[model samples]
Target: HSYVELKDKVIVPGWPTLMLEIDFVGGQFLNIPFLSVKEPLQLPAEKKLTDYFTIDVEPAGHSLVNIYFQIDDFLLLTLNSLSVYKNPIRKYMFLRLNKEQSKWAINAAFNVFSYRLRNIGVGPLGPDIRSSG
Candidate 1:
């Protein structure tokens, strides 16, 4: 029988994924459930995924929540083609985002994907979140 071949390395399923770790250091919302949004509502689900790869958040095995934004073959190609995100064949890249930029980073990432998915209908600001799910 044939099997996966590897000498000294292991293959990670989500090869080019972006990981964001958001920590709630001293937030009142952490204690007050009503003030904070639902965990699932915090990030877009079923909407952001492979064209591209899929992105999912992992909340287990750590004190803080880890957002795993996976980049698949197609999207990795698209990202590599762009001057903004292109890297010279590096295995790992670390992005340091302080609180200020981190807040905006999520918006920017979602907006770019929303723009791509807007042709048929809905856009980033097309309708209020109150209007639909």
Candidate 2:
């Protein structure tokens, strides 16, 4: 019988300290850890935060869009980004795995994505989710 790799022994490189800063209506702040905001977030004018979590838009013509995720330290963190247009969309979503138990990061990431699609009605679904790697 073959064994499945629950834990990816090989660590992905260039894993930065991804952070997503969000503000509420009443000036409430939420810190989404390990979620990096991708390019095309160019909304300096929309930047109303003192900390300045505005999405950056580059002059390369059209805005850049990319989404990335990582399963690290018993946590599944995903970053969602959109380019600067009339509207700017930036958000971070993550889930913590059971620390007391051992589980595969890939499976956990998949499960988190599935749960999010099922309930939240957001995120990449169907083939896109599978291709998110």
Candidate 3:
């Protein structure tokens, strides 16, 4: 029998095959999910590992709700790459009427596999509850 020679570390996989935490985080990201035109829609699931390695996020412990638009940007410290989500977001995703831009858009993915929502003043435009299961 043999154990994995490498220690457990956070990585998006495939890219930057070897490095420390900071190295992985520093790797550039691909901007994704551009909102061309839509009032609301489900965000596509993250299929890559690097997307989550750079940030700290988990599906089992937190509410995953946007809380409110007034909140500041959250910094995620990922311990490891978890699962890849598929199908519609259904929850944990929302589209806001951007009066400032005079358009409907969602700023969920700052980059492929990342979530960087900011400034709603306080909370969601409406309730979009998420399940931990």
Candidate 4:
């Protein structure tokens, strides 16, 4: 079993619009249609909780997806974790990991986790669309 936990309050600097995408990968034999979050969703952080975010994937008995995020379509952040939030209601908000580096990467895999804040300007990139089989 594996899970990701956010222990502290998260805040993205500059307060740009944030979006999340879950790239679900289906098994070769299961014939499970590729599933993912279609729209740019928010991480559930508006309300307070003991842990800001937590999710488990092993017990669910399903393959995980390549989670991704974009800051107003200008940058892309990959979720390097084994699990993801299963409930739609849980999607809310997330914090930026770096400011000095132009490339943004957040690895939520295994027991590895950290928090940081950065300022970024919003820019138009493209529509929110992803492909899967």
Candidate 5:
């Protein structure tokens, strides 16, 4: 028979992946929508419960957006990003998992991506959030 993983033996790896895009639902563009997100994350292999991941996003106006996410500890990651409005055609952006980077990076990016309404930086966006230029 199979056995169950104990507390210290549990690993929180690749999980809690999510994505979001700008669009008009019910004729109301996704300028800023109220969204609550949470899910149980898992590790790549059986390890220990070092930490976990959490993310959040909030809209400000017809364009500006705010977000906060993290990975907290050894196994926990966190981040925050805000996006400013530019166009009105709706943008599609998403995030899942990055097999290239380490488990840490994957979680980080995942959390950041989950906040679709937010901005992109470093390897993805420019110095500003509202600049397509």
Candidate 6:
């Protein structure tokens, strides 16, 4: 088992972009699901598994965001939903794991992705609940 940390900051009206350089020698592999965006970029055919991959995070408007990863059915890792304040907010990201498996298999069905909450805004008096009578 190993641990790593990557840190950075971003300004408003600009997205956060991260470059992940991965190296795998043996039977290990990494997988990232097709993330939905305005328009997806196509990858070259010659790129290998060890190449650098870029991650771009959209500025979220909701109050919560989630990042998720999994290792087959054996393990599930989630960054959990994080609270988001107004624009121009600061956030710190980290991943913590303790004495776990050293190696794991990557099957065809494996996937990794993220999600954000929808419809987070409310009226001045909050959500209406007048139908309880």
TM-score winner: 1
Per-model lDDT: 0.28, 0.25, 0.22, 0.23, 0.28, 0.22
Per-candidate TM-scores read: 0.28, 0.20, 0.15, 0.19, 0.23, 0.19
What digit string (tens of lDDT, one per residue) describes model 5 on residues 9-119?
Answer: 121122122222433222212222212113323344565323344433333333333333344344323211211111111122212222322233333332333223232
Candidate 3 backbone overlaps, count: 12
Q: Give me the runs in candidate 2 sitting further than 4 Å from their true place.
A: 1-15, 36-133
Q: lDDT score of model 4?
A: 0.23
Tens-digit lDDT string for candidate 3 (58-122):
12212231111111112111111211121111212222222332111123322223344211111
> RMSD, each candidate, Å?
16.7, 19.2, 19.4, 16.0, 19.1, 15.8
| lDDT, residue 118, model 2 | 9
lDDT of 1 by residue, 65-133 (tens): 323344455444433443122222122222223344344434333222221111122236534542445
Angstrom error of the Cα, residue 71, model 6: value is: 24
Estimate, for each residue in 9-111, the C-alpha lDDT of model 4 and write its tens digit.
2212222322322222321111111112222333345642213433221211122322211222111121211112232122322222222211112222312
Number of the predicted model whose lDDT against the real structure is largest: 1
Tens digits of per-residue lDDT for model 2, 1-133: 2212222211122232233433322312333332222232233354332232222211211222112323222121122322112111223212332322112322232222111110112233533643356
Total backbone clashes of model 4?
6
Per-candidate count of clashing residue pairs (backbone under 3 Å): 1, 7, 12, 6, 15, 0
lDDT of 5 at 15: 17
**For model 5, where is the 10-residue window of minimal lDDT?**
81-90
Query: Per-residue lDDT for 114 in model 1?
Result: 23
